[PDB]
Ligand binder design. Structure first.
Ligand SMILES: *[C@@H]1O[C@H](CO)[C@@H](O[C@@H]2O[C@H](CO)[C@@H](O[C@@H]3O[C@H](CO)[C@@H](O)[C@H](O)[C@@H]3O)[C@H](O)[C@H]2NC(C)=O)[C@H](O)[C@H]1NC(C)=O
Ligand SMILES: *[C@@H]1O[C@H](CO)[C@@H](O[C@@H]2O[C@H](CO)[C@@H](O)[C@H](O)[C@H]2NC(C)=O)[C@H](O)[C@H]1NC(C)=O
Ligand SMILES: *[C@@H]1O[C@H](CO)[C@@H](O[C@@H]2O[C@H](CO)[C@@H](O)[C@H](O)[C@H]2NC(C)=O)[C@H](O)[C@H]1NC(C)=O
Ligand SMILES: *[C@@H]1O[C@H](CO)[C@@H](O[C@@H]2O[C@H](CO)[C@@H](O)[C@H](O)[C@H]2NC(C)=O)[C@H](O)[C@H]1NC(C)=O
Ligand SMILES: *[C@@H]1O[C@H](CO)[C@@H](O[C@@H]2O[C@H](CO)[C@@H](O)[C@H](O)[C@H]2NC(C)=O)[C@H](O)[C@H]1NC(C)=O
Ligand SMILES: *[C@@H]1O[C@H](CO)[C@@H](O[C@@H]2O[C@H](CO)[C@@H](O)[C@H](O)[C@H]2NC(C)=O)[C@H](O)[C@H]1NC(C)=O
Ligand SMILES: *[C@@H]1O[C@H](CO)[C@@H](O)[C@H](O)[C@H]1NC(C)=O
Lengths: 49, 50, 99, 172, 50
């Protein structure tokens, strides 16, 4: 626990990127999370939204 | 599956029922060839700043 | 600021994404009780310490530094004259050695 | 108070989780800041029952056991001037007002009974007159100026404390 | 339990008493302070439209 002040900073910097990558795989109200699975599944007008 | 990456020979010994592996943060990093039943990782292609 | 106590010196040390300082401090450990006085009356005049404070071990009076015990004889080279001996509160009587 | 709303919100990732984590971090940061500001000594020093501080009157800044809250007059004047259904919760602080008052009283007693030696190590007792003499020698004034004008300085300090109390009790 | 703020030390204060130390202990204390953090240049375009 001597270098906890640096360990906390490293852990926060890692958790930020982890949360960002995890939110990359979210839906946000769309029909799916994969971009290609939404592109090559419907027409252009229905996929633009 | 789908994606873009450079494959390579892998050393990860999968299980007889597992097909594709994912590392932390839920990202596909290793897949199995369905024909020859070999394991090969999929690293992302080189990208950076100029 | 530079550690707890009277800072003497510090040594920097490298650390991953940071820096580590080794502060060397001066901390007193063993102290003793002493009877003190603001000044001394010798020949009607008051004698105040230049760099130190008056202490008494029960019978004799000495002048020593504030952060260490080093008793010395109350001489003219250690105490200066200022005013008289009728206004200082708590003043006492003691001889002042003249070299 | 909704079920379908939660199912719709679960598709937005972990925003609620990171917001709660940020709020908890802010709370822990405030607690640590209060502790680092006030909790700086390891022993709670108490002023002696005698008030022979060389004419200086500290009764207006020291705690009074007559009142329930162990706070002084200035602290009472300061505390008498500062004035749900959706998730808004206010967590109580770790160190209450009584503990902050005890820390302040310990700091004040250490300052008036030991000068500055209680910070670098053990509390070394020293008369307040000689402490003021050390202060004057530090600011560049000979200690004979204090030892020959102690009553005047004590009266000026008492008048200044009284004026500070009057100003804190009059305006806001 | 209600946390205690430390011990209770009553300094023997009087108008004719002084405590002058007779010894000393040279102590060395460490202090860790962050300086920098890991650089992270996230591609603003590839993250959303890989
Ligand atoms: C100020 O404090 C220091 C540190 O506590 C004192 O130094 C210590 O003095 C004692 C007394 O001589 C030493 O004990 C001796 O240890 C040897 C073995 O090393 C033993 O053979 C002797 O019979 C005796 O017990 C002690 O080692 C020493 N500590 C250090 C770190 O050197 C010092 O004496 C104190 N000053 C005064 C004026 O009291
Ligand atoms: C799919 O077919 C290929 C050949 O078309 C099979 O590969 C052969 O597998 C046998 C058994 O291990 C080997 O002895 C041959 O040398 C392989 N030939 C080649 C060209 O690789 C493969 O095993 C078949 N996979 C499945 C699941 O039936
Ligand atoms: C206070 O300090 C003085 C100065 O050292 C002490 O006087 C000495 O006492 C020793 C012990 O008997 C004698 O051998 C010396 O001859 C004395 N010197 C002088 C100049 O008088 C005195 O004893 C100390 N008093 C106490 C109570 O500790
Ligand atoms: C230091 O404080 C003590 C304690 O208040 C003073 O002793 C008092 O002296 C007066 C006058 O001689 C007496 O009437 C009291 O009865 C004493 N009180 C006690 C408890 O003994 C002493 O005079 C003070 N000394 C200085 C220099 O201020
Ligand atoms: C220090 O010495 C002076 C002078 O020897 C003392 O002053 C005397 O005090 C007595 C009693 O108050 C008077 O009767 C004398 O007339 C004073 N003499 C002078 C010359 O003023 C003084 O009391 C001594 N101080 C102490 C603390 O003993
Ligand atoms: C410090 O100041 C306070 C406030 O002036 C003093 O309290 C007064 O004490 C006298 C004498 O007992 C009373 O007649 C007043 O009514 C008190 N005033 C208040 C507002 O309480 C206190 O005595 C002073 N301290 C010392 C040691 O004299
Ligand atoms: C000084 O005297 C007081 C009261 O008798 C005592 O509590 C204290 O420990 C003494 N100082 C030392 C260094 O022993």
């Amino acid at each position: 626990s001597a270098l906890g002040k640096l360990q906390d900073v490293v852990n926060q910097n890692a958790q930020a990127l982890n949360t960002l990558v995890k939110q990359l795989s979210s839906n946000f109200g769309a029909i799916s999370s994969v971009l290609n699975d939404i592109l090559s599944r419907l027409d252009k007008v229905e996929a633009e939204v | 599956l789908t994606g873009t990456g450079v494959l390579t020979e892998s050393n990860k010994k999968f299980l007889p029922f597992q097909q594709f592996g994912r590392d932390i943060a839920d990202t596909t990093d290793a897949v199995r060839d369905p024909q020859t039943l070999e394991i090969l990782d999929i690293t992302p292609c080189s990208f950076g700043g100029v | 600021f530079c550690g707890k106590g009277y800072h003497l010196m510090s040594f920097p040390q490298s650390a991953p994404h940071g820096v580590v300082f080794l502060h060397v401090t001066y901390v007193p450990a063993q102290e003793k009780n002493f009877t003190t006085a603001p000044a001394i009356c010798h020949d009607g005049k008051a004698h105040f310490p230049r760099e130190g404070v008056f202490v008494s071990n029960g019978t004799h009076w000495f002048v020593t530094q504030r952060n260490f015990y080093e008793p010395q004889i109350i001489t003219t080279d250690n105490t200066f004259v200022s005013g008289n001996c009728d206004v200082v509160i708590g003043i006492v009587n003691n001889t002042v050695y003249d070299p | 108070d909704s079920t379908e709303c939660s199912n719709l919100l679960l598709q937005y990732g972990s925003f609620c989780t990171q917001l709660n984590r940020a709020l908890t971090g802010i709370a822990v940061e405030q607690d640590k800041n209060t502790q680092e500001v006030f909790a700086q000594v390891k022993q709670i020093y108490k002023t002696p029952p005698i008030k022979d501080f060389g004419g200086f009157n500290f009764s207006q800044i020291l705690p009074d056991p007559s009142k329930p809250s162990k706070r002084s007059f200035i602290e009472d004047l300061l505390f008498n001037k500062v004035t749900k259904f959706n998730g808004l919760t206010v967590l109580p602080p770790l160190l209450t007002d009584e503990m902050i008052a005890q820390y302040t009283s310990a700091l004040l007693a250490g300052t008036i009974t030991s000068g500055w030696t209680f910070g670098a190590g053990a509390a070394l007792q020293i008369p307040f007159a000689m402490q003021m003499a050390y202060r004057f020698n530090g600011i560049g004034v000979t200690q004979n100026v204090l030892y020959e004008n102690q009553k005047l300085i004590a009266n000026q300090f008492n008048s200044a404390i009284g004026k500070i109390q009057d100003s804190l009790s009059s305006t806001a | 339990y209600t946390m205690s703020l430390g011990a209770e030390n009553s300094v023997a204060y009087s108008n004719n008493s002084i405590a002058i130390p007779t010894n000393f202990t040279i102590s060395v204390t460490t202090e860790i302070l962050p300086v920098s953090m890991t650089k992270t240049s996230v591609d603003c375009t590839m993250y959303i439209c890989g």
